[PDB]
Enzyme design. Structure first.
Site, short mmCIF file in Angstrom:
data_model
loop_
_atom_site.label_atom_id
_atom_site.label_comp_id
_atom_site.label_asym_id
_atom_site.label_seq_id
_atom_site.Cartn_x
_atom_site.Cartn_y
_atom_site.Cartn_z
N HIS A 1 0.81 -1.22 0.00
CA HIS A 1 0.00 0.00 0.00
C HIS A 1 0.85 1.28 0.00
O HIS A 1 0.44 2.28 -0.55
CB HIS A 1 -0.93 0.03 1.24
CG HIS A 1 -1.72 -1.23 1.42
ND1 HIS A 1 -2.69 -1.62 0.53
CD2 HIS A 1 -1.69 -2.16 2.40
CE1 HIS A 1 -3.25 -2.74 0.95
NE2 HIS A 1 -2.65 -3.10 2.07
N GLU B 1 -3.57 13.43 1.03
CA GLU B 1 -4.81 12.99 1.66
C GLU B 1 -5.57 14.17 2.22
O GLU B 1 -6.70 14.45 1.81
CB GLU B 1 -4.48 11.94 2.75
CG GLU B 1 -3.87 10.66 2.12
CD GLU B 1 -4.09 9.43 2.94
OE1 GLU B 1 -3.69 9.45 4.12
OE2 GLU B 1 -4.57 8.47 2.36
C1 LIG Z 1 -3.96 -1.79 13.78
C2 LIG Z 1 -3.39 -0.65 13.07
C3 LIG Z 1 -2.93 0.26 12.50
C4 LIG Z 1 -2.34 1.40 11.81
N1 LIG Z 1 -0.93 1.19 11.53
S1 LIG Z 1 -0.03 2.52 11.26
O1 LIG Z 1 -0.36 3.44 12.30
O2 LIG Z 1 1.29 2.06 11.22
C5 LIG Z 1 -0.47 3.17 9.79
C6 LIG Z 1 -0.98 4.49 9.74
C7 LIG Z 1 -1.46 5.11 8.57
S2 LIG Z 1 -2.04 6.72 8.58
N2 LIG Z 1 -2.13 7.24 7.10
O3 LIG Z 1 -3.35 6.68 9.12
O4 LIG Z 1 -1.03 7.48 9.32
C8 LIG Z 1 -1.31 4.38 7.38
C9 LIG Z 1 -0.78 3.10 7.38
C10 LIG Z 1 -0.39 2.43 8.52
C11 LIG Z 1 0.22 1.08 8.41
O5 LIG Z 1 -0.29 0.14 9.04
O6 LIG Z 1 1.26 0.94 7.72
ZN LIG Z 2 -0.69 7.82 5.97
#
Ligand SMILES: CC#CCNS(=O)(=O)c1cc(S(N)(=O)=O)ccc1C(=O)O
Ligand SMILES: [Zn+2]
EC number: 4.2.1.1
Length: 257
Positions: A61, A103
């Site tokens: 992603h 975003e």
């Molecule tokens: C359970 C759970 C959870 C969220 N994981 S993250 O905070 O590392 C994260 C945060 C975001 S964001 N865009 O909300 O900061 C995006 C992607 C991730 C990821 O898993 O890689």
């Molecule tokens: Zn993010």
């Protein structure tokens, strides 16, 4: 599974993750005229001098630069926050073209990309427990525009060839995230959510007003990454951003006038 395509993109996520239609979803449009200056907000305290980066991962992603969060090394405090939040990872969201990618938006303006530095509240002991709490995370968001190169980003850019596909990782030690910050720490803040599944409503968002400049060549290298795994049909990792969600019963506060 979920992703950013026609068939599995943001408009579909609510079927597996009904909180997608919740009351404090992110990102949002930041209407600069409606955000109120709050003289009670403190300066943000970004203490990254002892940061220990470990690894860079293509998770299908985005790519995450991961840090050692087993002690208070790199922390975020102050601003709208009470207590201490430890840096766990950073990643970006970006577009297929320079006119989209962020975003958050600013008066409906989309930036070419957006950097997220994710931190968790140490009062909850671990990340997994923190994401279950309404004040569990603090995400520092920084806009990217295309212009001059960002020297502090090049080490990241140059490793991307080694993590082209989903599930690839590479050692990524001694990276200093201070080199990704703009001059000013002026910010907007609001309560929100993760912007990817599971979309949990556990984030205090802190979005810096001042974008950083990166070069066309730098962002071009982001767009050579792949969503797919090795040997699978190539799907370029581009447009990995969720669009703005309804503000609902929230106020965006500004740290500056
Ligand atoms: C359970 C759970 C959870 C969220 N994981 S993250 O905070 O590392 C994260 C945060 C975001 S964001 N865009 O909300 O900061 C995006 C992607 C991730 C990821 O898993 O890689
Ligand atoms: Zn993010």
């Amino acid at each position: 599974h979920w992703g950013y395509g026609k068939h599995n993109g943001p408009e579909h996520w609510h079927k597996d993750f009904p909180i997608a239609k919740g009351e404090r979803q992110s990102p949002v449009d930041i209407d600069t005229h409606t955000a109120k200056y709050d003289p009670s907000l403190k300066p943000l305290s970004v203490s990254y001098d002892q940061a220990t980066s470990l690894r860079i991962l293509n998770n299908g992603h985005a790519f995450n630069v991961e840090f050692d969060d087993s002690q208070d090394k790199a922390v975020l405090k102050g601003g709208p926050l009470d207590g201490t939040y430890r840096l766990i990872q950073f990643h970006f969201h970006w577009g297929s073209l320079d006119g989209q990618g962020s975003e958050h938006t600013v008066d409906k303006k989309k930036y070419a990309a957006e950097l997220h530095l994710v931190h968790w509240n140490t009062k909850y002991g671990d990340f997994g427990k923190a994401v279950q709490q309404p004040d569990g995370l603090a995400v520092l968001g920084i806009f990217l525009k295309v212009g001059s190169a960002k020297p502090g980003l090049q080490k990241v850019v140059d490793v991307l060839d080694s993590i082209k596909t989903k599930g690839k990782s590479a050692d990524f030690t001694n990276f200093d995230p201070r080199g990704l910050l703009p001059e000013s720490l002026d910010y907007w803040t609001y309560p929100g959510s993760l912007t990817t599944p599971p979309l949990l409503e556990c984030v205090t968002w802190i979005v810096l007003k001042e974008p950083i400049s990166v070069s066309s060549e730098q962002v071009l290298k982001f767009r050579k990454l792949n969503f797919n795994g090795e040997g699978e049909p190539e799907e370029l990792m581009v447009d990995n951003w969720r669009p703005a969600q309804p503000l609902k019963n929230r106020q965006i506060k500004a740290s500056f006038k």
